[PDB]
């Protein structure tokens, strides 16, 4: 299997757990599934890779199923980037 080439959408509000982590529920829109979900957290400038992804190698099984991704953004402003290139879903997050 390879990285998903297509776009992603979010099925529910991003939920902050009691363990200082965030859970994202994603739906794949593109082709080539099953494929690996490209997901990373970037700084305020949308440059350097920050925080971490908790879930092991998240996969999009098809274009109907929902992929549950647990991640840990750093404190303050960050950007959760789901997918590849300019088609990628960018989600602004602020951790208190």
């Amino acid at each position, epitope marked *: 299997y390879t990285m998903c080439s297509g776009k992603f959408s979010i099925d529910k509000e991003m939920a902050e757990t009691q363990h200082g982590t965030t859970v994202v529920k994603v739906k794949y829109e593109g082709a080539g599934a099953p494929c690996k979900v490209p997901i990373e957290i970037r700084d305020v400038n949308k440059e350097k890779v920050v925080g971490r992804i908790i879930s092991s190698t998240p996969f999009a099984e098809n274009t109907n199923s*929902v992929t549950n991704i647990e991640l840990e953004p750093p404190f303050g402003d960050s950007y959760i980037v789901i997918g590849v290139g300019d088609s990628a879903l960018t989600l602004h997050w602020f951790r208190k």
Partner: single-chain antibody
Amino acid sequence: VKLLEQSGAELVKPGASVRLSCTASGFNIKDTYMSWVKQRPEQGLEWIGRIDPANGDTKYDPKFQGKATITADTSSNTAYLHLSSLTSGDTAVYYCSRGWEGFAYWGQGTLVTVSAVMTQTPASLAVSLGQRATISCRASENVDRYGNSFMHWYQQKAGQPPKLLIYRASNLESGIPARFSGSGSRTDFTLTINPVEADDVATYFCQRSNEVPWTFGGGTKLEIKR
């Protein structure tokens, strides 16, 4: 495709109560938002409310509070709509739907017969074949969440459920021709159809979903210039 299976038509007397069902397949409802939408004959789409089946949290449009009760059973992967003290005003097609960034999935609709701000412009328009058509949506407040505009566009052809065209203001839904495009940020949004084709004759609706209520615009009927 058709992942949402709705219960059959209801024909009741006033004062009755009904419980409509929506069974999902190909996904677990726990991981989604399940909404119900009302449509009176020849009228616009009205968001009733939504359930988060994971915790049973429900939110309703102020108009439907006291009339509608949405429930969910994660074990049978079914969402329900309870309507109490039914009146002729409740006669409508009721749709169940899945999604937050627009409703990509709709049920077939359930007809319930009781035998007794989002500003969209224009109300209707006509354009010649091959020409550009533009439909506008103005929200009374900003519709951003996580730096993204939660503004969506739908097409609804006569006697059919609506279908998602554009989600998150400018993203083209899979299976939708590239002649459909969305633009805008802040409070003003536009759906562009260019070039217009004969098969584009339908009613178009905008919808916001950043915060509850997930209000639909009043709709715009598109016709071809005679």
